Design a binder for this molecule. Structure first.
Ligand code: NA
Length: 106
């Protein structure tokens, strides 16, 4: 069980057109550090429920969006507000690092 998925088909409607700030987790199953963040992304999604949307994009399954947005390594977190990219947090970082960035858009 984890956060909902976004893919290339739904990127515009779920991320760019969202009512709420959005946290996006770029990950892939070949990258173990990008999977090891799932418990703290899930903790964040529960804590921030109703203030942020949370989605994960599998760069193996949805290659167009990471290509377009210049993703070079995973995990990569991006935050969007009203259609605008507001932050990028690259690499397997602490929950506190992520909460700092999330709270900036609260
Ligand atoms: Na909340």
């Amino acid at each position: 069980t984890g956060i909902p998925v976004v893919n290339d088909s739904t990127w515009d409607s779920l991320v760019l057109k969202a009512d709420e700030p959005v946290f996006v987790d770029f990950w892939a199953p070949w990258c173990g550090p990008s999977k090891m963040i799932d418990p703290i992304v899930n903790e964040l999604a529960q804590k921030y429920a109703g203030q942020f949307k949370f989605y994960k994009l599998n760069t193996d399954e949805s290659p167009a969006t990471p290509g377009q947005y210049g993703v070079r390594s995973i995990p990569t977190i991006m935050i969007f507000v009203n259609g605008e990219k507001k932050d990028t947090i690259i690499g397997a970082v602490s929950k506190d690092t992520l909460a700092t960035s999330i709270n900036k858009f609260l």
